[PDB]
Amino acid sequence: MDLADRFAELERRYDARLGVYVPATGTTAAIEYRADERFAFCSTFKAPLVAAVLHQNPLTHLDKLITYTSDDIRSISPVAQQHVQTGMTIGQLCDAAIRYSDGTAANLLLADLGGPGGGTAAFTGYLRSLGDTVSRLDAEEPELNRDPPGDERDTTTPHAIALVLQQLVLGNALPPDKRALLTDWMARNTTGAKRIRAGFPADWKVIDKTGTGDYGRANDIAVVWSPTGVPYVVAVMSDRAGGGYDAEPREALLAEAATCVAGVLALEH
Fold this sequence. Notes:
The PDB classes it as hydrolase. The protein has 269 residues and is an alpha+beta fold. The protein is built from 9 helices and 9 strands. The protein is globular and about 55 Å long.
């Protein structure tokens, strides 16, 4: 019938709750589905986290060596694990955070930004400094993926998180040379092949940061570009709460919502 119905069926079939938001542009109307509902951040916080660590520091600070230990690694840490003995720079952690969704890298970035103990407060402040008065991070990795459904802790809304990304990539919340670094890591993202990239024809360019956690949490946030360069911002958010703490996340849901979006954004009827 019409787009809210399409999205309703996706939920019925995946046994999942769906949050979608795309801002309006010059020519397009905004797509919103549970866009003002709270959805677990999961690893999607790492994108704006890196903006904060970039905005609040000179480019020179990316070459600062952070030494950590296996004592630190308490979450999925593809890259951190490899560099535990030589230590990683802040550029290298920013990289790990975005491209491999690295949890330990996001944990050290949180500490660099606002101290041990103050890290997540400091992150939510960056959001606040961008007019986001809804989102909040109350815990580091891995605990931030583990709050029950209902719990406002460690959540954001699609409305909220999309607008934060629009600003970072398409607006002026970073100077170009810092902004370009964020985009290049989002564009070299290894973990998002099967979500919003897969709902969007290959001649459209995509940068994203995925998120996954308990209760079937799967999130992707992205900035796409038409073949002529016309940008749009996509946030898709999901949980499959019915199956409990260990419920299966459905990457195919996010490819499917990205397809409805792509379908609205691309067809000129």
